[PDB]
Design an enzyme around this catalytic site. Sequence first.
Site, PDB file in Angstrom:
ATOM      1  N   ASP A   1       0.685  -1.210   0.235  1.00  0.00           N
ATOM      2  CA  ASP A   1      -0.087  -0.033   0.107  1.00  0.00           C
ATOM      3  C   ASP A   1       0.714   1.177  -0.096  1.00  0.00           C
ATOM      4  O   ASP A   1       1.026   1.777   1.067  1.00  0.00           O
ATOM      5  CB  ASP A   1      -0.832   0.067   1.414  1.00  0.00           C
ATOM      6  CG  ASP A   1      -2.012   1.008   1.036  1.00  0.00           C
ATOM      7  OD1 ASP A   1      -2.084   1.868   0.200  1.00  0.00           O
ATOM      8  OD2 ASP A   1      -3.041   0.907   1.966  1.00  0.00           O
ATOM      9  N   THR A   2       0.822   2.131  -1.212  1.00  0.00           N
ATOM     10  CA  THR A   2       1.685   3.130  -1.417  1.00  0.00           C
ATOM     11  C   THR A   2       0.924   4.148  -0.502  1.00  0.00           C
ATOM     12  O   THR A   2       1.433   5.380  -0.185  1.00  0.00           O
ATOM     13  CB  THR A   2       2.017   3.472  -2.941  1.00  0.00           C
ATOM     14  OG1 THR A   2       0.496   3.792  -3.294  1.00  0.00           O
ATOM     15  CG2 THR A   2       2.639   2.304  -3.464  1.00  0.00           C
ATOM     16  N   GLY A   3      -0.352   4.065  -0.438  1.00  0.00           N
ATOM     17  CA  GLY A   3      -1.079   5.288   0.100  1.00  0.00           C
ATOM     18  C   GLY A   3      -1.192   5.141   1.658  1.00  0.00           C
ATOM     19  O   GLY A   3      -1.903   5.849   2.450  1.00  0.00           O
TER      20      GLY A   3
HETATM   21  C1  LIG Z   1      -7.428  -0.742   5.105  1.00  0.00           C
HETATM   22  C2  LIG Z   1      -7.929  -1.043   3.823  1.00  0.00           C
HETATM   23  C3  LIG Z   1      -7.063  -1.172   2.660  1.00  0.00           C
HETATM   24  C4  LIG Z   1      -6.102   0.012   2.337  1.00  0.00           C
HETATM   25  C5  LIG Z   1      -6.747   1.406   2.163  1.00  0.00           C
HETATM   26  C6  LIG Z   1      -5.619   2.588   2.517  1.00  0.00           C
HETATM   27  N1  LIG Z   1      -6.125   3.663   2.434  1.00  0.00           N
HETATM   28  C7  LIG Z   1      -5.359   4.814   2.585  1.00  0.00           C
HETATM   29  C8  LIG Z   1      -5.829   6.003   1.954  1.00  0.00           C
HETATM   30  C9  LIG Z   1      -5.551   7.375   2.663  1.00  0.00           C
HETATM   31  C10 LIG Z   1      -6.078   8.202   3.734  1.00  0.00           C
HETATM   32  C11 LIG Z   1      -7.745   8.455   3.368  1.00  0.00           C
HETATM   33  C12 LIG Z   1      -5.111   4.845   4.204  1.00  0.00           C
HETATM   34  O1  LIG Z   1      -5.984   4.326   4.956  1.00  0.00           O
HETATM   35  N2  LIG Z   1      -3.969   5.171   4.461  1.00  0.00           N
HETATM   36  C13 LIG Z   1      -3.397   5.122   5.834  1.00  0.00           C
HETATM   37  C14 LIG Z   1      -3.179   3.781   6.412  1.00  0.00           C
HETATM   38  C15 LIG Z   1      -2.979   3.599   8.017  1.00  0.00           C
HETATM   39  C16 LIG Z   1      -1.678   3.960   8.151  1.00  0.00           C
HETATM   40  N3  LIG Z   1      -1.216   4.704   9.603  1.00  0.00           N
HETATM   41  O2  LIG Z   1      -0.598   3.799   7.374  1.00  0.00           O
HETATM   42  C17 LIG Z   1      -2.741   6.312   6.253  1.00  0.00           C
HETATM   43  O3  LIG Z   1      -1.601   6.429   5.710  1.00  0.00           O
HETATM   44  N4  LIG Z   1      -3.067   6.903   7.601  1.00  0.00           N
HETATM   45  C18 LIG Z   1      -2.308   7.949   7.983  1.00  0.00           C
HETATM   46  C19 LIG Z   1      -2.876   9.470   7.837  1.00  0.00           C
HETATM   47  C20 LIG Z   1      -3.459   9.521   6.212  1.00  0.00           C
HETATM   48  C21 LIG Z   1      -4.246  10.972   6.588  1.00  0.00           C
HETATM   49  N5  LIG Z   1      -5.424  10.689   7.460  1.00  0.00           N
HETATM   50  C22 LIG Z   1      -6.248  11.711   7.955  1.00  0.00           C
HETATM   51  N6  LIG Z   1      -6.021  12.851   7.759  1.00  0.00           N
HETATM   52  N7  LIG Z   1      -7.224  11.397   8.841  1.00  0.00           N
HETATM   53  C23 LIG Z   1      -1.667   7.706   9.446  1.00  0.00           C
HETATM   54  N8  LIG Z   1      -0.361   8.015   9.812  1.00  0.00           N
HETATM   55  O4  LIG Z   1      -2.717   7.345  10.213  1.00  0.00           O
HETATM   56  N9  LIG Z   1      -7.629   1.368   1.140  1.00  0.00           N
HETATM   57  C24 LIG Z   1      -9.082   1.794   1.379  1.00  0.00           C
HETATM   58  O5  LIG Z   1      -9.296   2.172   2.392  1.00  0.00           O
HETATM   59  C25 LIG Z   1      -9.934   1.958   0.278  1.00  0.00           C
HETATM   60  N10 LIG Z   1     -10.721   0.746   0.303  1.00  0.00           N
HETATM   61  C26 LIG Z   1     -10.431  -0.431  -0.622  1.00  0.00           C
HETATM   62  O6  LIG Z   1      -9.891  -0.193  -1.652  1.00  0.00           O
HETATM   63  C27 LIG Z   1     -11.609  -1.427  -0.349  1.00  0.00           C
HETATM   64  N11 LIG Z   1     -11.869  -1.727   1.142  1.00  0.00           N
HETATM   65  C28 LIG Z   1     -11.292  -2.717   1.948  1.00  0.00           C
HETATM   66  C29 LIG Z   1     -11.911  -2.660   3.281  1.00  0.00           C
HETATM   67  O7  LIG Z   1     -10.508  -3.355   1.647  1.00  0.00           O
HETATM   68  C30 LIG Z   1     -12.668  -1.672  -1.120  1.00  0.00           C
HETATM   69  C31 LIG Z   1     -13.450  -2.843  -1.121  1.00  0.00           C
HETATM   70  O8  LIG Z   1     -13.683  -0.370  -1.047  1.00  0.00           O
HETATM   71  C32 LIG Z   1     -10.757   3.066   0.216  1.00  0.00           C
HETATM   72  C33 LIG Z   1      -9.884   4.152  -0.130  1.00  0.00           C
HETATM   73  C34 LIG Z   1     -11.814   2.928  -0.891  1.00  0.00           C
HETATM   74  C35 LIG Z   1     -11.477   2.726  -2.289  1.00  0.00           C
END
Ligand SMILES: CCCC[C@@H](CN[C@@H](CCCC)C(=O)N[C@@H](CCC(N)=O)C(=O)N[C@@H](CCCNC(N)=[NH2+])C(N)=O)NC(=O)[C@@H](NC(=O)[C@@H](NC(C)=O)[C@@H](C)O)[C@@H](C)CC
Lengths: 99, 99
Positions: B25-27
């Site tokens: 996950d690059t995101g």
């Molecule tokens: C967990 C589910 C799989 C990975 C996830 C990663 N999403 C990124 C999106 C960016 C934020 C909106 C993310 O959550 N990144 C987090 C992951 C947790 C982590 N700590 O690494 C992140 O970097 N979070 C940062 C902050 C980002 C900004 N957040 C904020 N301002 N509140 C952090 N340090 O907490 N993908 C998703 O959430 C996508 N879901 C999906 O692709 C599928 N859903 C599932 C549940 O698999 C599909 C069936 O809908 C969403 C976008 C719909 C297309």
Amino acid sequence: PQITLWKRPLVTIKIGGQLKEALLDTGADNTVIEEMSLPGRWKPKMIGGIGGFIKVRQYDQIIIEIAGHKAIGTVLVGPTPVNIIGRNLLTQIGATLNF
Amino acid sequence: PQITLWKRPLVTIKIGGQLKEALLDTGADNTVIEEMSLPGRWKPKMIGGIGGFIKVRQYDQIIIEIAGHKAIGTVLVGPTPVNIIGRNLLTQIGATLNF
Ligand SMILES: CCCC[C@@H](CN[C@@H](CCCC)C(=O)N[C@@H](CCC(N)=O)C(=O)N[C@@H](CCCNC(N)=[NH2+])C(N)=O)NC(=O)[C@@H](NC(=O)[C@@H](NC(C)=O)[C@@H](C)O)[C@@H](C)CC
């Protein structure tokens, strides 16, 4: 280009005549953009991930230029905290993960 | 390898001697794994996703293999819908986004 991952892979995109910053997310099945107006009919959808689900509006056949590369596909619009370019469009611009 | 995005970029990982499936996950800034037992002490961390925020347990210097590549770093454990390998470990295996 080759994008390293030391920082968030954020790029400038153009959608609906608007310039926005978006995150290239290989972990996202779909492309999700913050509230904005898009042409055409739409249908509701629930999308989930960390923290749960959010309700979005689904628009099809939407063109978006990602870092200079144009792609067409479905774009979900809703209360996403970050504009996300998902796999549905990443494939179109020929993006791949390499290591 | 070169991983296209037509399908979810799921790989096999090894942590605690167990094989699991995880999404490259690059995101994701960090690596978040579903509930499991990890050695040592943990610290609190709050992370945000598409649906909001969740609390997770942070374990540092955890030995983890990602698609055959060895990494040693921070692993967050909590109520994540899917095991995700974030930028912290993607950089360790030398992963880049290319198009
Ligand atoms: C967990 C589910 C799989 C990975 C996830 C990663 N999403 C990124 C999106 C960016 C934020 C909106 C993310 O959550 N990144 C987090 C992951 C947790 C982590 N700590 O690494 C992140 O970097 N979070 C940062 C902050 C980002 C900004 N957040 C904020 N301002 N509140 C952090 N340090 O907490 N993908 C998703 O959430 C996508 N879901 C999906 O692709 C599928 N859903 C599932 C549940 O698999 C599909 C069936 O809908 C969403 C976008 C719909 C297309």
